[PDB]
Amino acid sequence: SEEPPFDIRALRADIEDMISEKLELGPSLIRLAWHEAASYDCFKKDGSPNSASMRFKPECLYAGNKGLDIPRKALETLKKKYPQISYADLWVLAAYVAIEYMGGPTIPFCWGRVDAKDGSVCGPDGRLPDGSKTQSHVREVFRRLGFNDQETVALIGAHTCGECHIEFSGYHGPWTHRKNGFDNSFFTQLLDEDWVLNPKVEQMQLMDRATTKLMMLPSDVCLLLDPSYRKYVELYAKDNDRFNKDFANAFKKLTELGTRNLHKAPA
Amino acid sequence: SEEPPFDIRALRADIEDMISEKLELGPSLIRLAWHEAASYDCFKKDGSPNSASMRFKPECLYAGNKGLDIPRKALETLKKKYPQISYADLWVLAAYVAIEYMGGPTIPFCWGRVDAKDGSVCGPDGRLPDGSKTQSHVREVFRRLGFNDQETVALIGAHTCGECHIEFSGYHGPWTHRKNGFDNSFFTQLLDEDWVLNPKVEQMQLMDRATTKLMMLPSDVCLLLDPSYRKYVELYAKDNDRFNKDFANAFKKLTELGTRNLHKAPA
Numbered sequence: 001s002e003e004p005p006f007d008i009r010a011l012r013a014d015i016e017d018m019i020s021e022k023l024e025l026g027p028s029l030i031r032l033a034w035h036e037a038a039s040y041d042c043f044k045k046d047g048s049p050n051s052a053s054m055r056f057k058p059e060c061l062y063a064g065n066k067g068l069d070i071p072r073k074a075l076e077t078l079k080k081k082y083p084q085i086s087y088a089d090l091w092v093l094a095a096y097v098a099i100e101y102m103g104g105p106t107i108p109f110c111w112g113r114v115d116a117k118d119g120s121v122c123g124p125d126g127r128l129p130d131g132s133k134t135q136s137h138v139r140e141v142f143r144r145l146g147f148n149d150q151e152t153v154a155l156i157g158a159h160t161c162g163e164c165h166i167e168f169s170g171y172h173g174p175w176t177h178r179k180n181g182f183d184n185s186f187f188t189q190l191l192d193e194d195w196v197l198n199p200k201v202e203q204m205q206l207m208d209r210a211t212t213k214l215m216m217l218p219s220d221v222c223l224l225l226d227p228s229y230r231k232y233v234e235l236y237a238k239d240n241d242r243f244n245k246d247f248a249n250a251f252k253k254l255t256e257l258g259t260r261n262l263h264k265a266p267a
Numbered sequence: 268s269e270e271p272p273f274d275i276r277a278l279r280a281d282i283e284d285m286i287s288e289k290l291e292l293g294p295s296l297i298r299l300a301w302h303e304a305a306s307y308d309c310f311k312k313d314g315s316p317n318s319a320s321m322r323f324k325p326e327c328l329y330a331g332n333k334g335l336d337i338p339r340k341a342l343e344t345l346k347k348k349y350p351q352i353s354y355a356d357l358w359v360l361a362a363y364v365a366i367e368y369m370g371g372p373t374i375p376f377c378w379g380r381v382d383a384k385d386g387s388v389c390g391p392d393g394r395l396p397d398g399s400k401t402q403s404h405v406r407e408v409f410r411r412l413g414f415n416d417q418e419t420v421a422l423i424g425a426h427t428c429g430e431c432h433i434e435f436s437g438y439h440g441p442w443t444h445r446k447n448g449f450d451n452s453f454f455t456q457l458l459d460e461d462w463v464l465n466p467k468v469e470q471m472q473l474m475d476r477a478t479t480k481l482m483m484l485p486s487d488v489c490l491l492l493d494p495s496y497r498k499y500v501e502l503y504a505k506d507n508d509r510f511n512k513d514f515a516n517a518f519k520k521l522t523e524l525g526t527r528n529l530h531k532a533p534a
C-alpha cells in the first residue's frame with residue numbers, strides 16, 4: 001500500500017540472515033514482540049503497547065522480561081543499518097519474519113509505530129502472565145488485553161516454538177519435539193500425552209510420560225482443564241490450517257494494540 | 268499439672284463422641300486449629316494466633332477459611348456444655364483429640380488461651396498458604412510462622428487426613444487412600460506414585476497414575492521438588508514413628524504460637 005521510509009525488502013532479508021545464523025533467535029523474537037504488546041490494558045487504554053518501551057527501565061527489568069535483552073540487542077544491529085525503522089516496527093516485523101521462517105503464517109505487516117522515547121510511559125509491573133498460574137489468571141490477563149478465549153488459545157500456541165531457560169524463567173526445556181518449527185504441535189501434545197510431574201526441575205512443570213522430553217507449564221495445561229479453552233485446543237489439534245489462520249489474525253491484533261496511523265506494507 | 272476450670276476428661280469424651288458420629292469432622296477440626304494459628308507473623312509478632320479470632324469478621328470470610336464454619340459450629344455445642352473453656356483452647360483441644368482419634372500422636376495439651384473478643388485483633392488476609400503455589404510460597408509462609416523445613420514438612424503431612432471440597436477450595440477429593448486415618452501415607456504416596464495431571468478437575472491438581480483416586484496439590488508436590496523438603500519427605504516416608512513424634516512437636520508449637528501463661532493439663 002504505502003512504501004515505508006526503510007528498505008523493507010532488504011531489512012526482511014537481513015532479519016532472515018540473522019535468524020539463519022542463530023536459529024534460537026526466532027522464538028525469542030516472537031517472545032519479544034509479544035511482551036512489548038502484553039503491557040496493554042484495554043479498559044484503561046494504557047501500558048504503551050507496541051512502542052518498544054521495553055528498551056527502558058523499569059520495564060526492561062520486570063521479571064517476566066528476563067532474557068529479552070538478547071533479541072533486543074540482536075535487533076540493535078539492524079536498527080543501525082536501517083535507522084528509519086522504529087524499534088517498535090522492527091520488533092514486530094522481526095517477529096513476523098520469525099513466524100514465517102519457522103513455517104507459520106505470513107502475517108500482513110503494517111508499519112508506522114512510534115517509539116517510546118523514555119521509560120515514563122512504561123506500564124506497571126504485574127501485567128505479564130505467570131506460567132505457574134492457571135486459567136483464572138490466564139483469562140484475566142487476556143481479557144485485559146482484549147482477547148476472547150479463541151484468540152487466547154491460538155496465541156499460546158506460539159509455545160510450539162522455542163524453549164524455557166532456567167536463567168530467565170526458572171523453567172527448563174522445549175515444549176515440543178521440534179522447537180524451531182511452527183505448527184499445531186503444542187495442541188496435539190497437550191491432548192495426546194500423559195502429563196506427569198517432572199521431579200528434576202525445581203519449578204513445577206510437567207513432562208510427557210512417553211519420552212520425558214516434552215514439557216508443559218501449569219499455564220499451558222490449564223487450557224486442557226478449562227472447558228472453554230479445551231474446545232479450542234481440540235479445534236487446533238485437528239486443523240493446522242485453522243490454527244495458522246487464527247494465530248495470524250490474533251498475532252496481528254496483538255501487535256497492533258494501542259496503535260494508530262499505521263500503513264499497509266508492500267508485500 | 269494444673270486442673271483446668273472445665274471438666275477436661277468429660278469434654279474429651281464428648282469431643283470423641285462428636286467425632287464418632289461424623290468422622291469427617293476429625294480432619295476439619297485439625298484444619299480449624301491450624302488456620303487459627305496460621306495468621307501469625309513471628310517477625311511482627313501479630314496476627315493473634317490461637318485466640319479463636321476466626322469467629323469474627325473479617326477473618327471468618329477469608330477465602331482460605333471457607334468451610335471452617337462447620338467445625339466451629341460443631342464445637343459451639345460443646346462450648347455451651349463446657350462454658351469455662353475458651354474457644355481458643357477448645358479448638359486446640361479438639362484438634363489434639365482428633366489427631367489421636369485417627370491414630371496419630373497424643374500431644375500434651377496446655378490450657379489457658381484467652382479468646383479474641385472482637386474482629387479488630389484479626390490479622391490481615393493473605394497469610395494463609397495457597398495450594399496452587401509451590402515451595403517459594405510455602406517456605407515464605409512457614410518461615411513467617413517461625414518453622415524450619417523439617418517442621419514444615421511434618422506439618423503438611425496432616426494431609427494424610429481429610430479431603431478437599433469443591434465448595435471450599437475448588438479442589439476435590441482425599442489425598443490418601445484412608446482419609447480418616449493418620450499416618451505417614453502422604454509421604455509414601457508422594458514418593459511412590461506417578462503424579463499425573465487430573466484432567467477432570469478445573470483447579471489443577473494431580474492424581475496417581477495407578478488408581479487416579481489419590482490426589483496432590485501443587486503445594487504438596489513442591490515438597491518433592493525442593494531439595495531440602497524432599498529429604499524430610501524421604502525421612503517420614505521411611506519412619507512413621509519419627510513422623511508421629513515430629514508432627515506432635517510441630518503441631519504443639521503451632522498451637523502455642525503467640526500464647527502466654529499456659530498450664531499443663533492433667534493427662
Ligand code: HEM
Nearest residue numbers: 027028030034129130131155158162163164165168169219
Ligand atoms: C498464559 C500465557 C503465557 C505464559 C504464562 C507464558 C510463559 C512463558 C515462559 C515462562 C517462557 C520461558 C521464557 C524463558 O525461560 O526463556 C515463555 C517463552 C516463550 N513464549 Fe510464552 N507465555 C505465554 C504466552 C505467550 C504468547 C501469547 C506468546 C506469543 C504469541 C508467547 C511466546 C513465547 C515464545 C515464542 C517463547 C520461547 C522463547 C525462546 O525460545 O527464547 N508466549 N513463555
Ligand code: HEM
Nearest residue numbers: 294295297301396397398422425429430431432435436486
Ligand atoms: C502449604 C501448606 C498448606 C496448604 C497449601 C494447604 C491447603 C489445603 C487445602 C486447599 C485444603 C482443602 C480445604 C477444603 O477444600 O476443604 C486443605 C485441607 C486440609 N488441611 Fe491443609 N494446607 C496446608 C497446610 C496444612 C497444615 C500445616 C495442616 C495441619 C497441620 C493442614 C491440615 C489440613 C487438613 C486436616 C485438611 C482436611 C480438611 C477436611 O477434611 O475437612 N494443612 N489444606
Ligand SMILES: [Ca+2]
Nearest residue numbers: 036039048049
Ligand atoms: Ca510494552
Ligand SMILES: [Ca+2]
Nearest residue numbers: 303306315316
Ligand atoms: Ca488467627
Ligand SMILES: [K+]
Nearest residue numbers: 160176178181
Ligand atoms: K514446534
Ligand SMILES: [K+]
Nearest residue numbers: 427443445448
Ligand atoms: K490417611
